[PDB]
Design a protein around this ligand. Structure first.
Ligand code: NA
Ligand code: NA
Ligand code: NA
Ligand code: NA
Lengths: 408, 204
């Protein structure tokens, strides 16, 4: 169904069509450059101007104005319909899940004589995400991901998300010492990211690609005829969410094997947005399509030598010949019912091993749905209770909290 | 094959090995070893010595060996077991799972040691499983790790044979003696007996 918002948007003929924000820093994060690339559609005219202003609350910290026309990039010239403002910010207040300092970037498309044509805006978080010498660093410090996987689920409205439920989830997560959330396994409602920018959660933004049921799992993802479709799911995610500081990692999807389409789209992301690592678990969790060793349910000390996609002990995995990447479990500690036995072993390992930088628990909230008895009483239902067949009976309920957000 | 260089008693341990005035002496102990033993196939690894810290002389002689005989890796444990003077992470008495964070020369868990940022070398313990008396408790943990981890390629137990000496009672009967039984003072009493076999090669 139509399970997310439907809106009308009116823009001028001459409009802002896209805008990207990037933040660059010096060695100690005392100086930052906000680079705002603004694109326009419609009729170009020499009186058109773009002003990018940066605000800390009510205080203007930086501003920049320029006519359209970017620098020369190849033999045919540059983009006449683009302009890049480079604003300097001294001693920026850095964004993190601990201190979610945010600025406000306002992008004004106006005339030279000052008439405003339109204005767009975004929350800007000054932070650097990069993998250095095998460690995922945020603002120069190695992260320890206290993460959880979260589906968009409501027991009464299904997959329709509202602000109140999002806020409830974020509060509960932070109150239980989570600092990261994985969008399992699709781009979330837009507001989500904003809230995570505001409250301080690290986000893994995941393309809506899962082909788990294929045999083999990569039958489609290794097929060039499906590369267009997959591409749209990756590219359009990035184009939508790349300005959110909360998003620190891109994911190419989930449980779709490892095919050449993944490698291609990995490289596409790396080319268009080198500010964020890309991860992907499929095909053994350590393929060429991931910057992070991101296994699912790898155990601390016990190896699980499966053919072609073994799940090594995470400790062992780090030390395999030639392996230098950080290891962050995209899924671990399957919270199905009365579970999370052995969780402390994971966290002892995370704290002992530098390159074990945490993981994302599976998962936040039980995907149960409300049905009603003959006497009108509501009860929680799982696979098979709607006549759905075949079904995976109670495996929909893997949450740390009940569907009503009551904790387990 | 190990050069006859140990300066364990120096404070700091590298006082001589970091001193260029002792580079000639050290060099002779390394070079003349190689020149003597380089044709033996059994010798698979050169060692620059033992418990002499990490000084520039080690780096120099490491590179000398690598230049004259690139057929064998060079190892050296001093200065934290993972210095530039060793091709092999070769710690002494690093434990399987327990870290020993000593200042400037920590003894990480061998499993952890392999995975430290930037570390790619194999790990072979030059000394482990100190067989002093009734000992070798926990040996199986080492071997489980060795078999599970590819880059944990084993180690050298400390050590083969008790360094006891024979003395004789008033009645002419021989008995086994250790530090301090010859009037030697100061002495490290029974730490000379760390063997898997007695001095007469009877097994423990
Ligand atoms: Na860690
Ligand atoms: Na499930
Ligand atoms: Na091994
Ligand atoms: Na001894």
């Amino acid at each position: 169904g139509i399970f997310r918002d439907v809106s009308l948007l009116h823009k001028p003929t001459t409009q802002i069509s896209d805008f990207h924000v990037a933040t660059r820093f010096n060695d100690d994060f005392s100086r930052a450059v906000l680079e705002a690339e603004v694109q326009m559609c419609g009729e170009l005219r020499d009186y058109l101007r773009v002003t990018v202003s940066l605000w800390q609350g009510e205080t203007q910290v930086a501003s920049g104005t320029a006519p359209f026309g970017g620098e020369i990039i190849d033999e045919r010239g540059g983009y006449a319909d683009r302009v890049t403002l480079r604003l300097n910010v001294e001693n920026p207040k850095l964004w993190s899940a601990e201190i979610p300092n945010l600025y406000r970037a306002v992008v004004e498309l106006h005339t030279a004589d000052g008439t405003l044509i339109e204005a767009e805006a975004c929350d800007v978080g000054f932070r650097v995400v990069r993998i250095e010498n095998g460690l995922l660093l945020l603002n120069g410090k190695p992260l320890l991901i206290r993460g959880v996987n979260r589906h968009e689920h409501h027991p009464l409205h299904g997959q329709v998300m509202d602000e109140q439920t999002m806020v409830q989830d974020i509060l509960l997560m932070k109150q239980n010492n989570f600092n990261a959330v994985r969008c399992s396994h699709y781009p979330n409602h837009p507001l989500w990211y904003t809230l995570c920018d505001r409250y301080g959660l690290y986000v893994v933004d995941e393309a809506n690609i899962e082909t788990h049921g294929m045999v083999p799992m990569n039958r489609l993802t290794d097929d060039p005829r499906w590369l267009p479709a997959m591409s749209e799911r990756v590219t359009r995610m990035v184009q939508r969410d790349r300005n959110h500081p909360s998003v620190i990692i891109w994911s190419l999807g989930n449980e779709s094997g490892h095919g050449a389409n993944h490698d291609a789209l990995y490289r596409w992301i790396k080319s268009v947005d080198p500010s964020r690592p890309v991860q992907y678990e499929g095909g053994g969790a350590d393929t060429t399509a991931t910057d992070i060793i991101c296994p699912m349910y790898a155990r601390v000390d016990e190896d699980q030598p499966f053919p072609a996609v073994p799940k090594w002990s995470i400790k062992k995995w780090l030390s395999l010949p030639g392996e230098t990447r950080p290891l962050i479990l995209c899924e671990y500690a399957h919270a199905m019912g009365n579970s999370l036995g052995g969780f402390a072993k994971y966290w002892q390992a995370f704290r002992q091993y530098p390159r074990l930088q945490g993981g994302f628990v599976w998962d936040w909230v039980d995907q149960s749905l409300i049905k009603y008895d003959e006497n009108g009483n509501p009860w929680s239902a799982y696979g098979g209770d709607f006549g759905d067949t075949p079904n995976d009976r109670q495996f929909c309920m893997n949450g740390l909290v009940f569907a009503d957000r009551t904790p387990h």
